[PDB]
């Protein structure tokens with residue numbers, strides 16, 4: 478009651494014995510501020526007329542919504558002001574953003590300011606995704622500082638604007654969930670050291686793409702619906718917002734899939750600010766995250782807006798699908 482374990486307190490105490498300049502706390506405190514401001518706009522978006530498009534398109538091809546602009550501006554401004562960052566990569570910006578010398582700190586942040594664009598207008602859960610790297614280079618900060626493999630992440634996670642607003646944060650020792658208290662505008666710890674189940678009973682994929690799926694995905698799905706051992710078939714869930722489907726995978730277990738297909742060699746989701754952050758969360762929770770052929774966190778990106786296939790969740794479910802890919806593997 479009068480001893481609130483806030484996100485700030487947790488990350489300060491975490492980074493205590495480990496020493497540190499304390500800019501990670503600065504960064505996350507700043508991010509939390511933009512997340513609250515996004516949550517409040519979202520929760521009254523119809524009244525504030527924030528539905529509808531902005532009138533523009535993303536890089537490879539994406540219709541930019543009003544809340545994309547708002548959330549993008551908020552995240553960039555708070556990150557800059559935090560004095561903790563030097564390079565920013567956003568889904569909404571064609572090029573990396575370089576922070577001004579005076580406000581530069583040591584971190585590189587890749588983010589999706591608003592994830593779940595197709596679900597905005599129907600009031601389904603949407604979110605914010607981020608991954609944070611330490612700049613390694615010694616030269617002037619540049620776009621290349623963002624082109625690190627996922628395994629180099631120091632922290633990653635997401636905000637979920639669902640039935641409640643939740644900040645899920647993964648760092649080297651594990652995953653923790655903080656719920657926004659709307660009364661005092663603080664993220665409070667509600668789930669400690671989260672670990673995903675070894676095996677789940679939900680599969681999550683858009684079967685609208687059945688016609689384009691590779692034979693391994695096709696086989697796996699058939700197996701969920703017609704188990705060979707007479708076990709009960711898996712239930713299906715696909716909210717359509719990566720943050721919502723991945724969060725459910727984390728807390729209920731199971732598998733989430735956005736694979737490569739006949740029209741999309743690399744899938745749809747973006748490696749730097751969608752796939753890597755979630756793969757990292759999953760791995761810190763004891764889960765797996767693969768493209769079907771390689772670990773997502775091991776990919777070395779060459780494009781900040783690069784796409785990747787992703788299959789993640791409970792280790793025994795992801796493994797079962799890898800076995801099918803392996804079985805189908807060819808010259």
Ligand SMILES: O=P(O)(O)OC[C@H]1O[C@](O)(CO)[C@@H](O)[C@@H]1O
Pocket residue numbers: 592593594595683717718719720745746
């Ligand atoms: O409509 P589709 O192709 O299933 O795409 C849904 C995916 O697209 C995204 O909106 C990309 O931002 C994800 O949040 C989501 O998982």
Ligand SMILES: [Mg+2]
Pocket residue numbers: 545568589590591592593594
């Ligand atoms: Mg977005």
Ligand SMILES: [Mg+2]
Pocket residue numbers: 589591592593719751
């Ligand atoms: Mg997204």
Ligand SMILES: [Tl+]
Pocket residue numbers: 535539540541542545568569594
């Ligand atoms: Tl977008």
Ligand SMILES: [Tl+]
Pocket residue numbers: 542545591592593594595
């Ligand atoms: Tl969006």
Ligand SMILES: [Tl+]
Pocket residue numbers: 745746747751
């Ligand atoms: Tl995407």
Ligand SMILES: [Tl+]
Pocket residue numbers: 539568747
């Ligand atoms: Tl995207």
